[PDB]
C-alpha cells in the first residue's frame, strides 16, 4: 500500500509519502509565517504546495491520504466550509465561565479547559449571540481534509475529544446535542477509516488517482506516537524535547484534571499521558549543546552524585505533581560542571519516573517498555539513568515524524490496537 501522511504543526507543515511495500519514502516541507491575518488561506496554500512538491510518479500511486493537525485549533464555517470568522488557535484561551459547560460533559472531561474546542465554541456563541444551525465548527485536520473530500461536518474522536466528545461511550452528551450548539457539532468517525473518495477535480489537478481515499485524521501529539509502531498495552513513548512529554499505552482510561492528565481512545486500547515543564530547555539554560555533550561524556551513571534537583525552567509545575508556586531546586551547586549536569539529568530522570508511576497509580497498565523521542533520546548517559531508575528496557524510537505516523494511520488504520 502507498499512503500519504500530512502533518500540520505550529510553525509549519510536513508531508510524507510512504510506500510500505518496499519500503521507500519521500518527505517534503513548508514553513508558515509567524504572523498572518488569514491563517486558513495559509494552511490551504501549504496543502497545495505540499501536494505539488511530491514527485508525479509518487502521486500516481498514492491510494490513501490522512491529515493530522494541532489539537485545539478550530474554525467556524458555513455549510460550504468557508471561514466566517478567523480561527481560534490551540494556545488562545477564552474569557468564559467553565460552569456554563458543566451540563454538557462529565465533571472530569478534558473539554473543561479554557482552551478546549467546546469552550471556544461557547465563546463564539456569546460573541455572535446565536450561531446559525446551517454552520459548523471544524478542527484544523477536519477542515484540511474537507478540502480533499468535500464532506462537511466530519471528524475523528481524537480532535472531537476536547469538543466534548465521549470516546468511552462513542457519543456526545444528549444535553449538548439538545442545546443550541448541537447543530454545529460534526459526525465523529474512528481515525483511519475512509471518509470518502478524493474530489475528481483535485485528483485531475494533482495527477492523483481518482480512486484515492481520504481517511479520518488525528492530532499531531498522537500521530507522533503512532510513528513508533507501539501497539501493546504497557508500551510507552517518552519525548525528551524542550519539555518532557510522557505517553503510555493502557487497557484502561485514566484522568486527573489537576495535573492535566486525560486519555484518548485508541482502537480497543487507550493512550494516556502527561507533560512536565521540565525538560531539555532547563539544560540549555546552563550549557550550550556545545559543552553539553563534551560534559555528558564524562559522567558515570553507576555512581550517584548525591545531588537532588528539581529542574524547572521557571516558577510553576504541572505534572506529575501540580503546584504553581514550586521554585526550581538547583542547589547545592558543585563547581565541577560534570556533577552538576549529572544532577540535572538525575532530576529529569526522576520527573519521568514519578510521571509514569503516577500514571500507573491512576489505573493505567503497568509499564513494559520505553521508546524515546526528542533531542535527549540520543543521550546514552541519560538513558542509563532512566533505565536504572525505571527498570524496563529503553530504546530509541525508529521513527518520530508525525507525518510518518499519519501515513501509517492512512495505510493500516488503528487495526493493530486490538488483541484479537
Numbering used by the authors: 2 to 421
From the paper:
The At2g21370 gene product from Arabidopsis thaliana, xylulose kinase-1 (AtXK-1), whose mature form contains 436 amino acids, is located in the chloroplast (ChloroP 1.1 Server). SePSK and AtXK-1 display a sequence identity of 44.9%, and belong to the ribulokinase-like carbohydrate kinases, a sub-family of FGGY family carbohydrate kinases. Domain I exhibits a ribonuclease H-like folding pattern, and is responsible for the substrate binding, while domain II possesses an actin-like ATPase domain that binds cofactor ATP.
Our results suggested that three conserved residues (D8, T11 and D221 of SePSK) play an important role in SePSK function. To identify the function of these three residues of SePSK, we constructed D8A, T11A and D221A mutants. Using enzymatic activity assays, we found that all of these mutants exhibit much lower activity of ATP hydrolysis after adding D-ribulose than that of wild type, indicating the possibility that these three residues are involved in the catalytic process of phosphorylation D-ribulose and are vital for the function of SePSK. The O4 and O5 of RBL1 are coordinated with the side chain carboxyl group of Asp221. Three conserved residues in SePSK were identified to be essential for this function.
